[PDB]
């Protein structure tokens, strides 16, 4: 289609065809220890995890004291026109429901989602 | 690699169009995607075309690749030789290589395999 | 009749007819042209062909087992 | 090493006495050698000159209109210019060759999609016209005496005597039309009535020679039954 | 999602309506160019919890030369297909008196099912496909020439014109994509018509064995 003419649609189908894994869009990861979701060992993630916490869902059996924190690079994120919403559903939809992902808002400069 | 069209007045006009080239082959899926030309898309591996497209497609692709490797340095070789080679190479239905165990599986006599 | 093959003496049949007829002349066979001071048994066998007077019949074998016989007189000499 | 292997593969393929390329166990490989039936020794490069031009230049150069009365007076003699203008049968037969030409023009555009014009074919035609223009001292300044319906029917009769696949029944009368398909298109586009009354200007005597030579230099391009192809 | 799923089901459908048209069946004209939104309005907007259930998609067609011989196509629901599941279909053919049948397998089949279809040789011939392969018409590709299947009266005209046997022809195995697209059995002869640059057109023949 006109995708053969304009470079933008060519580049979007380019990114849509190329294979992309997770370690290409991550900056660093850290395994913390929050025995309570209100503990928030790292200093500043308390805001968004809390604004989730006043809407608390899925406290079915326990709360796992073990946490996994992932940091993302918006450079590698936007170049493929990705944002952590689709990642968030597919990292859940595709592996099971044994994991649970809460995330920031992209207006914040660094893109972190905790599991 | 241009897109040559025949205009309304009847002249050959060439057009520049974006093409994409990959490193790795799985064509049956790449053909099934949207806004990707399913006619002119091809791969430089011929067992893949054999499994995906057929046997005549292997004949023509092999001919094309032989022509492209021959005419790389401006040389030239007649057509009958390419046609005869790529016809006797895919005559018994499947791809038998001109190799040790490719000439070793035929109705040929006993005094030739000795 | 039903002759399906070409009426032209091919390149290979002309090289074998000239060889055989030349060897027969060397072993005292009678010639069929009025040569003039010629001695080479292969120069004579070439001017017999130009005059269509070689007494040999060619048997072409089709690949299905059949055959047909063409007199060298009946063929169109290629050269 | 690679050449030794490949030649060890294909040792016993050859042309049998019915023009089919058969294996050692008589397994047919091609119904005709090189799909045409000619040896790759007596061919050379030529041009089509029918697929590249536009739809207006085409009808301008390959038409032979017969209602001008003065250019027709310029190129043909007075004996033929009164006959061409006063016979509906001739005007009709000169109208169908253009139709048989446009169809071939449309078939060429699908055989050669890219648009090139360099093809390999039997006996050269432009050089054979140039020769006949000098064996007979053709002066390209005076009106010629070559009646056009002579050109049309001579080219038809010549096209009939170019047999690659000799047979009378169907499936042997259509493979013949498939074998000499490109050469007949080239021959019809080069020896049309307009071009040979406008550019070449051959005489009547110099046309039978050309017709007799096309056939004789074609019949000796056919492959020979027995060469280890 | 379902937008990907309503797209595929329309695409795969459009392919089959040509595959059965090639085999010489009667398919109405507008069924060939059924655009997407027309399909979306007829069978349903989405198959995810929708009216298109992968049933209500099946097709039954009749031959041109004869209204009795008919062909069916099935779209199984499970990803990989079991044993009685095809016998569910074998029963559905047993009741309607149809022998020509196809099954558009979704993702795969079982080796036991592979055994269960090669047994009914003299009756109830079924063709097993894949969902992925039917997504594109390979016949309209660039490299693929035009094939045509010859009746058994024409094949006896070749072998008597070129004075051939039937062992001396070029061969093609009945496992390559175009041998199945046309539904070819062993002992048939297919005719290829390709254009070449030396002659203009060349007709070759293949024996399917």
List the helices and strands and how they pair.
The structure is cut from a larger assembly and holds three copies of chain A, one copy of chain C (79 residues) and one copy of chain E (209 residues).
Chain A: H1 7-17, E1 26-30, H2 46-53, E2 69-72, H3 74-78, H4 84-92, E3 102-103, E4 111-114
Antiparallel strand pairs in A: 1-2, 2-4, 3-4
Chain C: E1 8-9, H1 11-26, H2 41-49, E2 57-61, E3 67-71, E4 76-77
Parallel strand pairs in C: 1-4
Antiparallel strand pairs in C: 2-3
Helix pairs in contact in C: 1-2
Chain E: H1 3-22, H2 36-42, E1 59-62, E2 70-74, E3 80-81, H3 84-96, E4 100-103, E5 108-109, H4 111-117, E6 126-128, E7 146-149, H5 155-161, E8 171-172, H6 177-181, E9 189-194, E10 202-208
PDB class: transcription
Keywords: tfiid, preinitiation complex, core promoter, transcription initiation, transcription
Entry title: TFIID-based intermediate PIC on PUMA promoter
Task: Describe this protein with a few key phrases.
part of a larger assembly, 5 chains, A: 115 residues, alpha+beta, four-stranded antiparallel beta sheet, 4 strands, 29% helix, elongated, C: 79 residues, Eukaryotic RPB6 RNA polymerase subunit, two-stranded parallel ribbon, two-stranded antiparallel ribbon, 2 helices, 32% helix, DNA-directed RNA polymerase subunit (chain A), DNA-directed RNA polymerase activity (chain C), DNA-directed RNA polymerase (chain C), transcription (chain C), DNA-directed RNA polymerases I, II, and III subunit RPABC2 (chain C)
What does this structure look like?
Chain A: It is found in: Chromosome; Cytoplasm; Nucleus. Chain A: It comes from Sus scrofa (Pig). Chain A: Belongs to the RNA polymerase beta' chain family. Chain A: This is DNA-directed RNA polymerase subunit. The structure is cut from a larger assembly and holds three copies of chain A, one copy of chain C (79 residues) and one copy of chain E (209 residues). Helix content of chain A is 29%, strand content 13%. Chain A has helices spanning 7-17, 46-53, 74-78, 84-92; strands at residues 26-30, 69-72, 102-103, 111-114. Chain C is α+β, with helices and mostly antiparallel strands. Chain C has helices spanning 11-26, 41-49, and strands spanning 8-9, 57-61, 67-71, 76-77. In chain C, the strands form two sheets. Chain C has a two-stranded parallel sheet with strand order 1-4. Chain C has a two-stranded antiparallel sheet with strand order 2-3. A four-stranded mixed beta sheet of chain E has the order 1-2-4-6, with no helix packed on it. Helix content of chain E is 28%, strand content 19%. Chain E is α/β, with parallel strands linked by helices. The termini of chain E are far apart. The interface between B and E is medium-sized, with 27 and 27 residues.
């Amino acid at each position: 289609g006109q995708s053969a003419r304009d470079a933008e649609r060519a580049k979007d189908i380019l990114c849509r065809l190329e294979h992309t894994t997770l370690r290409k869009v991550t900056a660093n990861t850290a395994i913390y220890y929050d025995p309570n979701p209100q503990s928030t060992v790292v200093a500043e993630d308390q805001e968004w995890v809390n604004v989730y916490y006043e809407m608390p869902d899925f406290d079915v059996a326990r709360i796992s004291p073990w946490l996994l924190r992932v940091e993302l690079d918006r450079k590698h994120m936007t170049d493929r026109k990705l944002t952590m919403e689709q990642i968030a559903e597919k990292i859940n939809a595709g592996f099971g429901d044994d994991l649970n992902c809460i995330f920031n808002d992209d207006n914040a400069e660094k893109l972190v989602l905790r599991i | 690699k241009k897109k040559i069209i025949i205009t309304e007045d009847g002249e050959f006009k060439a057009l520049q169009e974006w093409i994409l080239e990959t490193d790795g082959v799985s064509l049956m899926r790449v053909l099934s995607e949207k806004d990707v030309d399913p006619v002119r898309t091809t791969s430089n591996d011929i067992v893949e075309i054999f499994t995906v497209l057929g046997i005549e497609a292997v004949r023509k692709a092999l001919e094309r690749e032989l022509y492209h490797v021959i005419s790389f340095d401006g040389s030239y070789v007649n057509y009958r030789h390419l046609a005869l080679l790529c016809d006797t190479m895919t005559c018994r239905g499947h791809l038998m290589a001109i190799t040790r165990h490719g000439v070793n599986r035929q109705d040929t006599g006993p005094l030739m395999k000795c | 009749q039903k002759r399906i093959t070409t009426p032209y003496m091919t390149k290979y049949e002309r090289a074998r007819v000239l060889g055989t007829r030349a060897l027969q002349i060397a072993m005292c066979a009678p010639v069929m042209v009025e040569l003039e001071g010629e001695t080479d048994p292969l120069l004579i066998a070439m001017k017999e062909l130009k005059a269509r007077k070689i007494p040999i019949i060619i048997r072409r074998y089709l690949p299905d087992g059949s055959y047909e016989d063409w007199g060298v007189d009946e063929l169109i000499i290629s050269d | 090493y690679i050449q030794r292997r490949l030649i060890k593969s294909m040792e016993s393929v050859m042309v049998k006495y019915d023009a089919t390329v058969r294996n050692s166990i008589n397994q047919v490989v091609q119904l005709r050698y090189g799909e045409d039936g000619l040896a790759g020794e007596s061919v050379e490069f030529q041009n089509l000159a029918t697929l590249k031009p536009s739809n207006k230049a085409f009808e301008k150069k390959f038409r032979f209109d017969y209602t001008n009365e003065r250019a027709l007076r310029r190129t043909l003699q007075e004996d033929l210019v009164k006959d061409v203008l006063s016979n509906a049968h001739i005007q009709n037969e000169l109208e169908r060759e253009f139709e048989r030409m446009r169809e071939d023009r449309e078939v060429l555009r699908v055989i050669f999609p890219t648009g090139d014009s360099k093809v390999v074919l039997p006996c050269n035609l432009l050089r054979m016209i140039w020769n006949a223009q000098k064996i007979f001292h053709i002066n390209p300044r005076l009106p010629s005496d070559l009646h056009p319906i002579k050109v049309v029917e001579g080219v038809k009769e010549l096209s009939k005597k170019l047999v690659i696949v000799n047979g009378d029944d169907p499936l042997s009368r259509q493979a013949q039309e498939n074998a000499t398909l490109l050469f007949n298109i080239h021959l019809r586009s080069t020896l049309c009535s307009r071009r040979m009354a406008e550019e070449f200007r051959l005489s009547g005597e110099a046309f039978d020679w050309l017709l007799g030579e096309i056939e004789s230099k074609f019949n000796q391009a056919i492959a020979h039954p027995g060469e280890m192809v | 999602d379902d937008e990907e799923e309503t797209y595929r089901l329309w695409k795969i459908r459009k392919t089959i309506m040509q595959l059965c048209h090639d085999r010489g069946y009667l398919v109405t004209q507008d069924e060939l160019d059924q655009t997407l939104e027309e399909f979306k309005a007829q069978f349903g907007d989405k198959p995810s919890e929708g009216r298109p259930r992968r049933t209500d998609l099946t097709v039954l067609v009749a031959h041109n030369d004869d209204p009795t011989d008919q062909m069916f196509v099935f779209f199984p629901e499970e990803p990989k297909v079991g044993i009685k599941t095809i016998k569910v279909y074998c029963q559905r053919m047993q009741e309607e008196n149809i022998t020509r049948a196809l099954i558009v397998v979704q993702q795969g089949m079982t080796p036991s099912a592979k055994q269960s279809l090669v047994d009914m040789a003299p009756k109830y011939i079924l063709e097993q496909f894949l969902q992925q392969e039917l997504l594109i018409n390979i016949t309209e590709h660039e490299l693929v020439p035009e094939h045509v299947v010859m009746t058994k009266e024409e094949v006896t005209e070749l072998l008597a014109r070129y004075k051939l046997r039937e062992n001396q022809l070029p061969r093609i195995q009945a496992g390559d994509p175009v041998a199945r697209y046309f539904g070819i059995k062993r002992g048939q002869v297919v005719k290829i018509i390709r254009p070449s640059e030396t002659a203009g057109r060349y007709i070759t023949y293949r024996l399917v064995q």
